[PDB]
Write a protein that binds this ligand. Structure first.
Ligand SMILES: CC[C@H]1OC(=O)[C@H](C)C(=O)[C@H](C)[C@@H](O[C@@H]2O[C@H](C)C[C@H](N(C)C)[C@H]2O)[C@@H](C)C[C@@H](C)C(=O)/C=C/[C@]1(C)O
Ligand SMILES: [K+]
Ligand SMILES: [Mg+2]
Ligand SMILES: [Mg+2]
Ligand SMILES: [Mg+2]
Ligand SMILES: [Mg+2]
Ligand SMILES: [Mg+2]
Ligand SMILES: [Mg+2]
Ligand SMILES: [Mg+2]
Ligand SMILES: [Mg+2]
Ligand SMILES: [Mg+2]
Ligand SMILES: [Mg+2]
Ligand SMILES: [Mg+2]
Ligand SMILES: [Mg+2]
Ligand SMILES: [Mg+2]
Ligand SMILES: [Mg+2]
Ligand SMILES: [Mg+2]
Ligand SMILES: [Mg+2]
Ligand SMILES: [Mg+2]
Ligand SMILES: [Mg+2]
Ligand SMILES: [Mg+2]
Ligand SMILES: [Mg+2]
Ligand SMILES: [Mg+2]
Ligand SMILES: [Mg+2]
Ligand SMILES: [Mg+2]
Ligand SMILES: [Mg+2]
Ligand SMILES: [Mg+2]
Ligand SMILES: [Mg+2]
Ligand SMILES: [Mg+2]
Ligand SMILES: [Mg+2]
Ligand SMILES: [Mg+2]
Ligand SMILES: [Mg+2]
Ligand SMILES: [Mg+2]
Ligand SMILES: [Mg+2]
Ligand SMILES: [Mg+2]
Ligand SMILES: [Mg+2]
Ligand SMILES: [Mg+2]
Ligand SMILES: [Mg+2]
Ligand SMILES: [Mg+2]
Ligand SMILES: [Mg+2]
Ligand SMILES: [Mg+2]
Ligand SMILES: [Mg+2]
Ligand SMILES: [Mg+2]
Ligand SMILES: [Mg+2]
Ligand SMILES: [Mg+2]
Ligand SMILES: [Mg+2]
Ligand SMILES: [Mg+2]
Ligand SMILES: [Mg+2]
Ligand SMILES: [Mg+2]
Ligand SMILES: [Mg+2]
Ligand SMILES: [Mg+2]
Ligand SMILES: [Mg+2]
Ligand SMILES: [Mg+2]
Ligand SMILES: [Mg+2]
Ligand SMILES: [Mg+2]
Ligand SMILES: [Mg+2]
Ligand SMILES: [Mg+2]
Ligand SMILES: [Mg+2]
Ligand SMILES: [Mg+2]
Ligand SMILES: [Mg+2]
Ligand SMILES: [Mg+2]
Ligand SMILES: [Mg+2]
Ligand SMILES: [Mg+2]
Ligand SMILES: [Mg+2]
Ligand SMILES: [Mg+2]
Ligand SMILES: [Mg+2]
Ligand SMILES: [Mg+2]
Ligand SMILES: [Mg+2]
Ligand SMILES: [Mg+2]
Ligand SMILES: [Mg+2]
Ligand SMILES: [Mg+2]
Ligand SMILES: [Mg+2]
Ligand SMILES: [Mg+2]
Ligand SMILES: [Mg+2]
Ligand SMILES: [Mg+2]
Ligand SMILES: [Mg+2]
Ligand SMILES: [Mg+2]
Ligand SMILES: [Mg+2]
Ligand SMILES: [Mg+2]
Ligand SMILES: [Mg+2]
Ligand SMILES: [Mg+2]
Ligand SMILES: [Mg+2]
Ligand SMILES: [Mg+2]
Ligand SMILES: [Mg+2]
Ligand SMILES: [Mg+2]
Ligand SMILES: [Mg+2]
Ligand SMILES: [Mg+2]
Ligand SMILES: [Mg+2]
Ligand SMILES: [Mg+2]
Ligand SMILES: [Mg+2]
Ligand SMILES: [Mg+2]
Ligand SMILES: [Mg+2]
Ligand SMILES: [Mg+2]
Ligand SMILES: [Mg+2]
Ligand SMILES: [Mg+2]
Ligand SMILES: [Mg+2]
Ligand SMILES: [Mg+2]
Ligand SMILES: [Mg+2]
Ligand SMILES: [Mg+2]
Ligand SMILES: [Mg+2]
Ligand SMILES: [Mg+2]
Ligand SMILES: [Mg+2]
Ligand SMILES: [Mg+2]
Ligand SMILES: [Mg+2]
Ligand SMILES: [Mg+2]
Ligand SMILES: [Mg+2]
Ligand SMILES: [Mg+2]
Ligand SMILES: [Mg+2]
Ligand SMILES: [Mg+2]
Ligand SMILES: [Mg+2]
Ligand SMILES: [Mg+2]
Ligand SMILES: [Mg+2]
Ligand SMILES: [Mg+2]
Ligand SMILES: [Mg+2]
Ligand SMILES: [Mg+2]
Ligand SMILES: [Mg+2]
Ligand SMILES: [Mg+2]
Ligand SMILES: [Mg+2]
Ligand SMILES: [Mg+2]
Ligand SMILES: [Mg+2]
Ligand SMILES: [Mg+2]
Ligand SMILES: [Mg+2]
Ligand SMILES: [Mg+2]
Ligand SMILES: [Mg+2]
Ligand SMILES: [Mg+2]
Ligand SMILES: [Mg+2]
Ligand SMILES: [Mg+2]
Ligand SMILES: [Mg+2]
Ligand SMILES: [Mg+2]
Ligand SMILES: [Mg+2]
Ligand SMILES: [Mg+2]
Ligand SMILES: [Mg+2]
Ligand SMILES: [Mg+2]
Ligand SMILES: [Mg+2]
Ligand SMILES: [Mg+2]
Ligand SMILES: [Mg+2]
Ligand SMILES: [Mg+2]
Ligand SMILES: [Mg+2]
Ligand SMILES: [Mg+2]
Ligand SMILES: [Mg+2]
Ligand SMILES: [Mg+2]
Ligand SMILES: [Mg+2]
Ligand SMILES: [Mg+2]
Ligand SMILES: [Mg+2]
Ligand SMILES: [Mg+2]
Ligand SMILES: [Mg+2]
Ligand SMILES: [Mg+2]
Ligand SMILES: [Mg+2]
Ligand SMILES: [Mg+2]
Ligand SMILES: [Mg+2]
Ligand SMILES: [Mg+2]
Ligand SMILES: [Mg+2]
Ligand SMILES: [Mg+2]
Ligand SMILES: [Mg+2]
Ligand SMILES: [Mg+2]
Ligand SMILES: [Mg+2]
Ligand SMILES: [Mg+2]
Ligand SMILES: [Mg+2]
Ligand SMILES: [Mg+2]
Ligand SMILES: [Mg+2]
Ligand SMILES: [Mg+2]
Ligand SMILES: [Mg+2]
Ligand SMILES: [Mg+2]
Ligand SMILES: [Mg+2]
Ligand SMILES: [Mg+2]
Ligand SMILES: [Mg+2]
Ligand SMILES: [Mg+2]
Ligand SMILES: [Mg+2]
Ligand SMILES: [Mg+2]
Ligand SMILES: [Mg+2]
Ligand SMILES: [Mg+2]
Ligand SMILES: [Mg+2]
Ligand SMILES: [Mg+2]
Ligand SMILES: [Mg+2]
Ligand SMILES: [Mg+2]
Ligand SMILES: [Mg+2]
Ligand SMILES: [Mg+2]
Ligand SMILES: [Mg+2]
Ligand SMILES: [Mg+2]
Ligand SMILES: [Mg+2]
Ligand SMILES: [Mg+2]
Ligand SMILES: [Mg+2]
Ligand SMILES: [Mg+2]
Ligand SMILES: [Mg+2]
Ligand SMILES: [Mg+2]
Ligand SMILES: [Mg+2]
Ligand SMILES: [Mg+2]
Ligand SMILES: [Mg+2]
Ligand SMILES: [Mg+2]
Ligand SMILES: [Mg+2]
Ligand SMILES: [Mg+2]
Ligand SMILES: [Mg+2]
Ligand SMILES: [Mg+2]
Ligand SMILES: [Mg+2]
Ligand SMILES: [Mg+2]
Ligand SMILES: [Mg+2]
Ligand SMILES: [Mg+2]
Ligand SMILES: [Mg+2]
Ligand SMILES: [Mg+2]
Ligand SMILES: [Mg+2]
Ligand SMILES: [Mg+2]
Ligand SMILES: [Mg+2]
Ligand SMILES: [Mg+2]
Ligand SMILES: [Mg+2]
Ligand SMILES: [Mg+2]
Ligand SMILES: [Mg+2]
Ligand SMILES: [Mg+2]
Ligand SMILES: [Mg+2]
Ligand SMILES: [Mg+2]
Ligand SMILES: [Mg+2]
Ligand SMILES: [Mg+2]
Ligand SMILES: [Mg+2]
Ligand SMILES: [Mg+2]
Ligand SMILES: [Mg+2]
Ligand SMILES: [Mg+2]
Ligand SMILES: [Mg+2]
Ligand SMILES: [Mg+2]
Ligand SMILES: [Mg+2]
Ligand SMILES: [Mg+2]
Ligand SMILES: [Mg+2]
Ligand SMILES: [Mg+2]
Ligand SMILES: [Mg+2]
Ligand SMILES: [Mg+2]
Ligand SMILES: [Mg+2]
Ligand SMILES: [Mg+2]
Ligand SMILES: [Mg+2]
Ligand SMILES: [Mg+2]
Ligand SMILES: [Mg+2]
Ligand SMILES: [Mg+2]
Ligand SMILES: [Mg+2]
Ligand SMILES: [Mg+2]
Ligand SMILES: [Mg+2]
Ligand SMILES: [Mg+2]
Ligand SMILES: [Mg+2]
Ligand SMILES: [Mg+2]
Ligand SMILES: [Mg+2]
Ligand SMILES: [Mg+2]
Ligand SMILES: [Mg+2]
Ligand SMILES: [Mg+2]
Ligand SMILES: [Mg+2]
Ligand SMILES: [Mg+2]
Ligand SMILES: [Mg+2]
Ligand SMILES: [Mg+2]
Ligand SMILES: [Mg+2]
Ligand SMILES: [Mg+2]
Ligand SMILES: [Mg+2]
Ligand SMILES: [Mg+2]
Ligand SMILES: [Mg+2]
Ligand SMILES: [Mg+2]
Ligand SMILES: [Mg+2]
Ligand SMILES: [Mg+2]
Ligand SMILES: [Mg+2]
Ligand SMILES: [Mg+2]
Lengths: 275, 48
RNA sequence: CCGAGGGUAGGGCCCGUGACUGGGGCGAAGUCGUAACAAGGUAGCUGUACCGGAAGGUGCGGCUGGAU
RNA sequence: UGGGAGAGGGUGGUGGAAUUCCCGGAGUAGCGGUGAAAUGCGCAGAUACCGGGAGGAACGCCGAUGGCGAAGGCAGCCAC
RNA sequence: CGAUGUCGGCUCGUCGCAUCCUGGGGCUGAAGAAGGUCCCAAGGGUUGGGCUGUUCGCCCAUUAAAGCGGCACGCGAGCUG
RNA sequence: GAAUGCCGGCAUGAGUAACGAUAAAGAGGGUGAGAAUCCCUCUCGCCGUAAGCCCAAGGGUUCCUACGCAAUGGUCGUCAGCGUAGGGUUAGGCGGGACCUAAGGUGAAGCCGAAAGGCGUAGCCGAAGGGCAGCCGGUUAAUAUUCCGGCCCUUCCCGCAGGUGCGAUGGGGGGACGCUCUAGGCUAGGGGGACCGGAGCCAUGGACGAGCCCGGCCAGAAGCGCAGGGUGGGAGGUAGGCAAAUCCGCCUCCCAACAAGCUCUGCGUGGUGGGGAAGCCCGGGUGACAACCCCCCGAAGCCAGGGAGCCAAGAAAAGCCUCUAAGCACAACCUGCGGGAACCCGUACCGCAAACCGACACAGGUGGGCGGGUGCAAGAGCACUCAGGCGCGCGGGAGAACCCUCGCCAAGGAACUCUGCAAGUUGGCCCCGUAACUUCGGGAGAAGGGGUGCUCCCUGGGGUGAUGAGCCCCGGGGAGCCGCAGUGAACAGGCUCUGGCGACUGUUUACCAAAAACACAGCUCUCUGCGAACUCGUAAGAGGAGGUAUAGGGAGCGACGCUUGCCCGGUGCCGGAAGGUCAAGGGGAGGGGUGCAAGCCCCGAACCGAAGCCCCGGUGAACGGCGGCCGUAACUAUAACGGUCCUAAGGUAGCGAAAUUCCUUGUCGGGUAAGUUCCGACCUGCACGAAAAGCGUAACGACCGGAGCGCUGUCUCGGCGAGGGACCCGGUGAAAUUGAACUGGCCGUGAAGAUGCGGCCUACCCGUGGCAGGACGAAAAGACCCCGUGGAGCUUUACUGCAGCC
RNA sequence: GAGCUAGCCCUGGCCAGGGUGAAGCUGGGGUGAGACCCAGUGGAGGCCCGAACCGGUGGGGGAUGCAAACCCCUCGGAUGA
RNA sequence: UGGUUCGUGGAGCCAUGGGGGAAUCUGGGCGGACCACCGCCUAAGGCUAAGUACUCCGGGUGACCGAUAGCGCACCAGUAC
């Protein structure tokens, strides 16, 4: 769990990598991948709309099953656990007794060779998927649909988890990975357990070059630019911001709430986020 | 040192060529003007 | 060949000494407070941590070498 | 070999009292605090009372001058 | 101001004299030696170094002496930067 | 007659600079009206990981031959990439199309936009990626995997034979993949041979020799051999692969699992077809019936989709195999054989350059492959050389100053200078040895030394082969020889001590700045619950992301260590269903106009009425800020201490004459003979200070300070020598500039610095090589500075609007 | 107008040779078992030296240039951002 | 909000982006806010020659040019570059 290195180079001093101990298959399923078109941050106009993207490692997309309710009552064996470069979680390859194969994001505690199943009847065991209304209150859970049949949306990053606090009406109350308390419909599926690879957050990139491999190009401070470029531009020598800290587009970036006031979801959010 | 003109037959006909001018209103006005001035060639030569 | 020693370079140990700096001891009648000895007027002491002109204070845990 | 007491250790679970916050109700002119006050909180509806919800910590009675451990130390209850 | 390149250093001089040294003098509170002060004198001479961009100055070791000033603060179609 | 006017023409500078790498030339013969320059020969020199040879791009006849020399060629020209004419590029297999998909572009359906237009799944287009059949030699003045020779191969059509449930733009398999390291066996390529073949050679003192010199191959179907790649076989069930399916997928059972078998490539052999040198003759003949063998080195290439380890987790689609649906099983497909058919476009030539990009026959720039040998530890490094290619399209003399590039130097050795700038020194390999400090990796090639050639003798292990000889790679030991000197030549660190800044490798002002600046791992704040926030767009649509709070955006700080204090009064942001103010709208007290009148029309107070602002709170790794004056101790001095005024609060730790200190070279210490710099200290900090972070910090740095050693032409202080220029002769022949010129010194005068005025002095006429004081010398209508009710970038609590948001 | 230049997207290619010797594995020691130690093996890395290639540090030359950014000597990176 | 001479003006008229929303002659618009009288005209469908504009083209004519003029072009010019 997080391997360090000897300081035999200045960058190896602090660079740490994952242990990869839970991986059991080093190549993807040839029928479950398709090429992932790198955007480099540029949109259909050819315009940079997200800055500092691009130049990272070539990748293939693993088609993940964020529905699960496709195959109610059809068990599947956990055949392997693999690396996916498109998310922080690991992925679990499932051989359905159908002969169908699919990926799910691999929760913590999963083990190759066990069995998983989805549906109202499913037992409350790591890997099983159920509509939220059938899962006991207080269960930790991931891959939650935000609306019935729309796809697992919440709790998908490595180590994240959501907890069913209680129920009212057709809706159940979850505490999200951000500490938010939110109502989600009871028909919404979810999978029990937390997402695996929790040590993902203790990784130290270690050098500039590791951000580049991930496609993260260098971020330039507004204070290093000129008035034409950014509200923090200019100054003779260094300069404090000398005005409320703004983004490149001039909106304040220190506390200014940006969520839309009249949003229809506000009726389903019980309490804003945590720390 | 390396200079600005680096000829490329494929780049030429795809940027200034006849079929490129006909795809936009601005390119068509070029040819309209260029015809109206009696220019002997509407479009740069490139040997395909 | 060896060789007293001379020469070159680099280490180790000890002694003297140094602008200045740190506390220590001692010094009949200096300044500031009053922490301990009575429950010493907030019981004291304690390891540690933080803080404060100073003795000290305070938090956590501990001891009775604590009075009623 | 056959037995016996015990807060001895570790892991995993789990119960109620109470404090705090938030929601709702009902209700009004102060609450809180000290040696005495004041800061503070309260008509933007506090305190006191009821209902619900969220969370963390410590285990009241039994508890004793008691028991266990090499010492430090170990106290709700359940299982290994 | 349709441009007179601006500090200092180097190189290369040349001039003035209110003379730093050498030469000639008077006065001296000039015994001697060595000084003080003024007069005459521009022929020649007027060192090497440490610090600083420095001019200047301070210091070290000497010296007969280690002079002051001018020449677009002499000298960038001569160099340095 | 002037506009630094416009256009043209012609002068000055001037027979001046220059003639484009310092790789280099000389002679003989020839051609021609004419020759340093063209052709031929010999001699010399230069490149040889190229300055040699293939390929691609770009260029577009420049290629070959004949005849020419006006211009082009920096001179010449008889020559040429020039002029005229004639000739030259040949493919089922090479490259591209009639095949595939990539980003991207386009775009049925569909969406959007005043118009023009913008998007957009499928589809289609799009290549140097995938896929797909030719190798050797010969021939031409000029093309050749293209013509010809030999030996091979593919696809389409039709036929015959045999086989089979045939059949597709649909299902499935496959195609199908990274980086680093790398095994086995081969080939490419190279080295040696006492062997095989070869025209000759014996010089000049010796050698007739195991002598010298030249050469000892290439391609090749099936089969076979060696080395490798891919690959389980059978049955039962099936609900999944958007219909079907015997294929695939999943489960169960049997058999076989480092194999074998089957299959596909590489290499070898292989019927057969080729090639074949020095030398000597005149590109050709001969050599020649040429020989065509053994040994060794050996890839980065091949077998290959090989293996291992690793994290950053490494295209698609067709060809192809298989599965079946309609349909059809007189068909259709598969296999083999045979004949027939096989289209379009490119192909010349230059191609690190005189033919491409740079206005030039321009010292610049331009992607891929091959790139020999010997020695130096390796190598594509360095030196020399093969093959092949050149001597750079002005030359001949001379032997000045001065310039560039280069060599050396007595004694001294940084005294030079802003600075050791520059140049010395050091220099590879092997062995010995190697400090503070440290994050234990390092600092480290620290430092400092010793060795290095050749001959003879003995000796150890390795690859090949076989276990031996031979060949080849690594050594150990002993005795000697020579020189000033043995990495004898070329290529190849000077070192240390101590400060500042920045952790680090990186990045940057193309073309005056490479840095301390930017970035950077890491830290904190804050926003965002997904049709996310945010960003681009009028929009649709996109990016964010086929991601989901261990995620994503924004901001500051900048590895790491130890830390980051107090102030929320003002601005910002966060919260606050009360209160105040609040526009449209609601309301309608009450007036007004007009009409004979019902009516029509106008204005209008209270009162309700959003966000915003006001108001009450919170909030600093949010904008920011963090006092003054007076007094006090048993010597003096200084104040732990007290007084009072003010503030929102009064700068904590740490550091300090500092990249910050004005006074200032502060003061004291160190270093020095001497230290405005440097280091260490003190603290009256003009005017440090804690994420515009504070203080340290091993390692790192073409950064910037200070010092020492070494060593030097930097210097005292210069001298000599080399080449390339300058100089002279022959050839060609510019430039800016230029009112006109018959254009001297001084002292004056003058718009205040006079060749040109006054007075005096000096001076025969004209040049060449030189130096730069003047012609307020040339160049650029001064960038500084001011002015203009000139302009542009940028800012904000300047004004007024706009997008955006509420 | 992105045939220059800046960034990104798709698909290809390139980086002689030498040095250092991480994790891992193996063996030995050690212990109750361990950690840990030693040796061999291995071949990591914005590691080290140095061509090609990419740069442009310092000086000199050039300055109507060979060149509207060049030449020479010196120097940086050279498996990687 | 646009048009008109009309820039919010006492601002009608014409047109229309939004909200409300009739009537068929005893219906409706206008005569510069509005009201009355007096008058003018019949919206929410369409077409319609001529008289007006211009000169790529062809003629005729100049107190128009005469090769630096007149078109950029008298000529192989939108060419060479
Ligand atoms: C590299 C070569 C060029 O020269 C220069 O760059 C040198 C460094 C210059 O300084 C030049 C001479 C500039 O001239 C100076 O400009 C100053 C503001 C004013 C000076 N003047 C006495 C006051 C004046 O001499 C320049 C404005 C004039 C140029 C355009 C010029 O005419 C020639 C330029 C060169 C020769 O190409
Ligand atoms: K100025
Ligand atoms: Mg590490
Ligand atoms: Mg390691
Ligand atoms: Mg894992
Ligand atoms: Mg794949
Ligand atoms: Mg696929
Ligand atoms: Mg981007
Ligand atoms: Mg696009
Ligand atoms: Mg586009
Ligand atoms: Mg962005
Ligand atoms: Mg993963
Ligand atoms: Mg829901
Ligand atoms: Mg990546
Ligand atoms: Mg940054
Ligand atoms: Mg800046
Ligand atoms: Mg801009
Ligand atoms: Mg701005
Ligand atoms: Mg600013
Ligand atoms: Mg800036
Ligand atoms: Mg700035
Ligand atoms: Mg500043
Ligand atoms: Mg700045
Ligand atoms: Mg700031
Ligand atoms: Mg400010
Ligand atoms: Mg701002
Ligand atoms: Mg916003
Ligand atoms: Mg929230
Ligand atoms: Mg180009
Ligand atoms: Mg092309
Ligand atoms: Mg092309
Ligand atoms: Mg192109
Ligand atoms: Mg083109
Ligand atoms: Mg024509
Ligand atoms: Mg055109
Ligand atoms: Mg002696
Ligand atoms: Mg006390
Ligand atoms: Mg006391
Ligand atoms: Mg007490
Ligand atoms: Mg006591
Ligand atoms: Mg105090
Ligand atoms: Mg306290
Ligand atoms: Mg206590
Ligand atoms: Mg007591
Ligand atoms: Mg009220
Ligand atoms: Mg002036
Ligand atoms: Mg002038
Ligand atoms: Mg001038
Ligand atoms: Mg001038
Ligand atoms: Mg005298
Ligand atoms: Mg006298
Ligand atoms: Mg006397
Ligand atoms: Mg004199
Ligand atoms: Mg001085
Ligand atoms: Mg001066
Ligand atoms: Mg001074
Ligand atoms: Mg004297
Ligand atoms: Mg003066
Ligand atoms: Mg001067
Ligand atoms: Mg001068
Ligand atoms: Mg100059
Ligand atoms: Mg000067
Ligand atoms: Mg001059
Ligand atoms: Mg001069
Ligand atoms: Mg300077
Ligand atoms: Mg006139
Ligand atoms: Mg002129
Ligand atoms: Mg003019
Ligand atoms: Mg003119
Ligand atoms: Mg002219
Ligand atoms: Mg003349
Ligand atoms: Mg002339
Ligand atoms: Mg002339
Ligand atoms: Mg002339
Ligand atoms: Mg002359
Ligand atoms: Mg010239
Ligand atoms: Mg020249
Ligand atoms: Mg000769
Ligand atoms: Mg002739
Ligand atoms: Mg000739
Ligand atoms: Mg001739
Ligand atoms: Mg060679
Ligand atoms: Mg051309
Ligand atoms: Mg040819
Ligand atoms: Mg002729
Ligand atoms: Mg000619
Ligand atoms: Mg001629
Ligand atoms: Mg002639
Ligand atoms: Mg000519
Ligand atoms: Mg000629
Ligand atoms: Mg020429
Ligand atoms: Mg030809
Ligand atoms: Mg042809
Ligand atoms: Mg053929
Ligand atoms: Mg070809
Ligand atoms: Mg066809
Ligand atoms: Mg296609
Ligand atoms: Mg389109
Ligand atoms: Mg296309
Ligand atoms: Mg292709
Ligand atoms: Mg062949
Ligand atoms: Mg012929
Ligand atoms: Mg068959
Ligand atoms: Mg079939
Ligand atoms: Mg098929
Ligand atoms: Mg590929
Ligand atoms: Mg890797
Ligand atoms: Mg071969
Ligand atoms: Mg060899
Ligand atoms: Mg010979
Ligand atoms: Mg195999
Ligand atoms: Mg022959
Ligand atoms: Mg014969
Ligand atoms: Mg493999
Ligand atoms: Mg595709
Ligand atoms: Mg039939
Ligand atoms: Mg055809
Ligand atoms: Mg053709
Ligand atoms: Mg050809
Ligand atoms: Mg040529
Ligand atoms: Mg060629
Ligand atoms: Mg080149
Ligand atoms: Mg090439
Ligand atoms: Mg030439
Ligand atoms: Mg050239
Ligand atoms: Mg070669
Ligand atoms: Mg070597
Ligand atoms: Mg050359
Ligand atoms: Mg030449
Ligand atoms: Mg000459
Ligand atoms: Mg001469
Ligand atoms: Mg000599
Ligand atoms: Mg000599
Ligand atoms: Mg010497
Ligand atoms: Mg010395
Ligand atoms: Mg010395
Ligand atoms: Mg110097
Ligand atoms: Mg200095
Ligand atoms: Mg220095
Ligand atoms: Mg040297
Ligand atoms: Mg050397
Ligand atoms: Mg160490
Ligand atoms: Mg050494
Ligand atoms: Mg040595
Ligand atoms: Mg010898
Ligand atoms: Mg063997
Ligand atoms: Mg020697
Ligand atoms: Mg070296
Ligand atoms: Mg300093
Ligand atoms: Mg740096
Ligand atoms: Mg640091
Ligand atoms: Mg740092
Ligand atoms: Mg850094
Ligand atoms: Mg620059
Ligand atoms: Mg610039
Ligand atoms: Mg430039
Ligand atoms: Mg420069
Ligand atoms: Mg700079
Ligand atoms: Mg640099
Ligand atoms: Mg920068
Ligand atoms: Mg930090
Ligand atoms: Mg926008
Ligand atoms: Mg999206
Ligand atoms: Mg997407
Ligand atoms: Mg930075
Ligand atoms: Mg910073
Ligand atoms: Mg430390
Ligand atoms: Mg505040
Ligand atoms: Mg505030
Ligand atoms: Mg407040
Ligand atoms: Mg309204
Ligand atoms: Mg009336
Ligand atoms: Mg309001
Ligand atoms: Mg403030
Ligand atoms: Mg302060
Ligand atoms: Mg404080
Ligand atoms: Mg503190
Ligand atoms: Mg100080
Ligand atoms: Mg300061
Ligand atoms: Mg100072
Ligand atoms: Mg100062
Ligand atoms: Mg001083
Ligand atoms: Mg001293
Ligand atoms: Mg200091
Ligand atoms: Mg002081
Ligand atoms: Mg500061
Ligand atoms: Mg700040
Ligand atoms: Mg600052
Ligand atoms: Mg510091
Ligand atoms: Mg440090
Ligand atoms: Mg340290
Ligand atoms: Mg650096
Ligand atoms: Mg640097
Ligand atoms: Mg010299
Ligand atoms: Mg010479
Ligand atoms: Mg000529
Ligand atoms: Mg005249
Ligand atoms: Mg005259
Ligand atoms: Mg005057
Ligand atoms: Mg005068
Ligand atoms: Mg005169
Ligand atoms: Mg006159
Ligand atoms: Mg007169
Ligand atoms: Mg006169
Ligand atoms: Mg005279
Ligand atoms: Mg002459
Ligand atoms: Mg002359
Ligand atoms: Mg002159
Ligand atoms: Mg002058
Ligand atoms: Mg002008
Ligand atoms: Mg002017
Ligand atoms: Mg100007
Ligand atoms: Mg300027
Ligand atoms: Mg002014
Ligand atoms: Mg004004
Ligand atoms: Mg004015
Ligand atoms: Mg203005
Ligand atoms: Mg402006
Ligand atoms: Mg580009
Ligand atoms: Mg391009
Ligand atoms: Mg490389
Ligand atoms: Mg090793
Ligand atoms: Mg490296
Ligand atoms: Mg350079
Ligand atoms: Mg460059
Ligand atoms: Mg140098
Ligand atoms: Mg220049
Ligand atoms: Mg160069
Ligand atoms: Mg060089
Ligand atoms: Mg290197
Ligand atoms: Mg390398
Ligand atoms: Mg008005
Ligand atoms: Mg109006
Ligand atoms: Mg109106
Ligand atoms: Mg009717
Ligand atoms: Mg009527
Ligand atoms: Mg009516
Ligand atoms: Mg109307
Ligand atoms: Mg009306
Ligand atoms: Mg009317
Ligand atoms: Mg009226
Ligand atoms: Mg009318
Ligand atoms: Mg009508
Ligand atoms: Mg008409
Ligand atoms: Mg008409
Ligand atoms: Mg006519
Ligand atoms: Mg006429
Ligand atoms: Mg004419
Ligand atoms: Mg005319
Ligand atoms: Mg015309
Ligand atoms: Mg003309
Ligand atoms: Mg043209
Ligand atoms: Mg022409």
């Amino acid at each position: 769990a997080v391997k360090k290195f000897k300081p035999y180079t200045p960058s190896r001093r602090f660079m740490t990598v994952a242990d990869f101990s839970e991986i059991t298959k080093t190549e993807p399923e040839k029928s479950l991948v398709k090429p992932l078109k790198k955007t480099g941050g540029r949109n259909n106009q050819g315009r940079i709309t997200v800055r500092f993207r691009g130049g990272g490692h070539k990748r293939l997309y693993r088609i993940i099953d964020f529905k699960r309710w496709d195959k109610v009552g059809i068990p599947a064996k956990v055949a392997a656990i693999e690396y996916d470069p498109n998310r922080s979680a690991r992925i679990a390859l499932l051989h359905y007794v159908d002969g169908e194969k699919r990926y799910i994001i691999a929760p913590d505690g999963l083990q190759v060779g066990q069995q998983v199943v989805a549906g109202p009847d499913a037992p409350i065991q790591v890997g099983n998927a159920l509509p939220l209304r059938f899962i006991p209150v207080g269960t930790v859970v991931h891959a939650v649909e935000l609306e019935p049949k729309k796809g697992a949306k919440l709790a998908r990053a490595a180590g994240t988890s959501a907890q069913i606090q209680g129920r009212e009406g057709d809706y159940v109350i979850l505490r999200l990975p951000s500490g938010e308390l939110r109502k989600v419909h009871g028909e919404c599926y979810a999978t029990v357990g937390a997402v695996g690879n929790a040590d993902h957050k203790n990784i130290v990139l270690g050098k500039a070059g590791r951000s580049r491999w991930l496609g993260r190009r260098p971020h330039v401070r507004g204070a290093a630019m000129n008035p034409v470029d950014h509200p923090h531009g200019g100054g003779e020598g260094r300069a404090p911001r000398g005005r409320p800290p703004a983004s490149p587009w001039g909106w304040q970036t220190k506390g200014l709430k940006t969520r839309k006031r009249r949003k229809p979801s506000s009726r389903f959010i019980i309490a804003r986020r945590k720390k | 040192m390396k200079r600005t003109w680096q000829p490329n037959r494929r780049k030429r006909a795809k940027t200034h060529g006849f079929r490129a001018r006909m795809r936009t209103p601005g390119g068509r006005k070029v040819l309209k003007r260029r015809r109206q001035k009696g220019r002997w060639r509407l479009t740069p030569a490139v040997r395909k």
